[PDB]
Each structure stands twice: as structure tokens, then as C-alpha cells.
Design a protein around this ligand. Structure first.
Ligand code: NA
Length: 266
């Protein structure tokens, strides 16, 4: 059959879906390792690859992007997906490629960007890309990272670390922060990211854990909110999202807490 991550119910999407809103007409760029468009439960509307060795953004050699992309879809089934391939088959990519995929989203008028990816070093140009995307009105979401903790140090990666990005940590089914989830003052909200079941390449399904799994729930969520309020700006979308979370533990670890889409959409 299939699975829908349990995070769809947990972030309260079904209520949006039941109000009639499902991400309709919202453009979401899934900045990852491609998306296997050949999957039946997955419809990709377009995309582009910045990985020179891997020229087909609709071919996913890793599984990462298909999974992440199926999670967005699960939260917002009618969203339009763009596969922006910046991570090759090993799971890694240049910062350059990433900016390139980010510059492609701005230019193609994406409404939402999901980056379930991260690096330990800052880039002023990656920082400029995300800032420009947000300035262009795109809602940018990224994984907060899977670096655990380190004393008092922020373990939030880049770009999750920039203030213009919404960095998403991961919770499990019982809202407990996942051991691996990065922490730090830049962590903004949480979403499920432990053993999340989603689509895989070759008419498959599988679960994975990671802030990368959390990120797409928050991105599919912004797409639900948009479909209900297409005139809201990104700033508005994002604010509703942070302002209506279910508070959990302290902020260094959980951020503002878990997102509640029913509430966010108002
Ligand atoms: Na941030």
C-alpha cells in the first residue's frame, strides 16, 4: 500500500485538508538530490539540475529527494513540485550548486523552498541567496541539521542558521526531540522527523529519520497556509507558523515548539 508519515496528523494537516485546503496552486521547490518523478504517487511539475555529473533532476540516485518530496505531498497533496537537484548520488553537493538551485527558485517564482540539507560553514553568497529569496517573497525552509549538541554551542547548520531561514528540528511521535536534532538559538520550530515513511525511488515506500524529514512537513504546511490565503506574504506565512506552535521544551532545543497547521492557517 502506502504510508503517510504520522507527522501529517501530528502537525494537524488533516483539518486543513478537511476545510478544503491542500496546497493547491502553490509552487514548492525541493532543493535536494532530485525527485524520482516516475513514482505514481508523485507528480513533479518541473525542476532543474545543478549537479554537473547528474543532468536529470527527475532521476534520483540517492532516494533522499523523492522521500522528502513525498512528505511535502503528504502534507499538501495538491502542491506543485519542482525537483531542484543540488545533491548528487552520494548525498552531497557544492554550495555553489545549492545557490544555483536557490537562484533558480527565485527566478521561477517558487512560493516555497525546502532545503533538507546543510553544511558546517557559512557562505556570504549562500547567505545572500536565501536573503534574496525571502526578500523576493519565497518562504524558505531548511533542515536544522542532525548534529546533536555540543555544550552551549549552536549545532544548527547552513543555511538553516541564517535568520532569513526557518530552521526545523525534529520530534518523534511523542513530541520528544530526536537525539540527533541540531540545537541552538537559530532553531525555529519543530516537526516530526523520526521514522517518517514516504515515497522512494521505484514504486516504493520507506522511513527515514532526520531534520530532513522534519523540514518538508513545515514546507508542505506553508503550502497549505498559502492555498487558504494566497494573498499572504511569506513573512505572514512564516509568522503564523512560528506563532502558533505547540510549545514543547526549552527553546535552545525545541525552538518555538511544534507547528500546528490548523492554527497557523487561521
Ligand atoms: Na534560523
Amino acid at each position: 500500500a502506502k504510508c503517510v508519515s504520522y507527522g501529517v496528523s501530528q502537525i494537524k494537516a488533516p483539518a486543513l485538508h478537511s476545510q478544503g485546503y491542500t496546497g493547491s496552486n502553490v509552487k514548492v521547490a525541493v532543493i535536494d538530490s532530485g525527485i524520482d518523478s516516475s513514482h505514481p504517487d508523485l507528480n513533479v511539475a518541473g525542476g532543474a539540475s545543478f549537479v554537473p555529473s547528474e543532468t536529470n533532476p527527475f532521476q534520483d540516485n540517492n532516494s533522499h529527494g523523492t522521500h522528502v518530496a513525498g512528505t511535502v505531498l503528504a502534507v499538501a497533496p495538491s502542491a506543485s513540485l519542482y525537483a531542484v537537484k543540488v545533491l548528487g548520488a552520494d548525498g552531497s553537493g557544492q554550495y555553489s550548486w545549492i545557490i544555483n538551485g536557490i537562484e533558480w527558485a527565485i527566478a521561477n517564482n517558487m512560493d516555497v523552498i525546502n532545503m533538507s540539507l546543510g553544511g558546517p560553514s557559512g557562505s556570504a553568497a549562500l547567505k545572500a541567496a536565501v536573503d534574496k529569496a525571502v526578500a523576493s517573497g519565497v518562504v524558505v525552509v531548511a533542515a536544522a541539521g542532525n548534529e546533536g549538541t555540543s555544550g552551549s554551542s549552536s549545532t544548527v547548520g547552513y543555511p538553516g542558521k541564517y535568520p532569513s531561514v526557518i530552521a526545523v528540528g525534529a520530534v518523534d511521535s511523542s513530541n520528544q526531540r530526536a537525539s540527533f536534532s541540531s540545537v541552538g538559538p537559530e532553531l525555529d520550530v519543530m516537526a516530526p522527523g523520526v521514522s517518517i515513511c514516504s515515497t522512494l525511488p521505484g514504486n516504493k515506500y520507506g522511513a527515514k529519520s532526520g531534520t530532513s524529514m522534519a523540514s518538508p512537513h513545515v514546507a508542505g504546511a506553508a503550502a497549505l497556509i498559502l492555498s487558504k490565503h494566497p494573498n499572504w506574504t511569506n513573512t505572514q506565512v512564516r509568522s503564523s507558523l512560528e506563532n502558533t506552535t505547540t510549545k514543547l521544551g526549552n527553546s535552545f532545543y525545541y525552538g518555538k515548539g511544534l507547528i500546528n497547521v490548523q492554527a497557523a492557517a487561521q
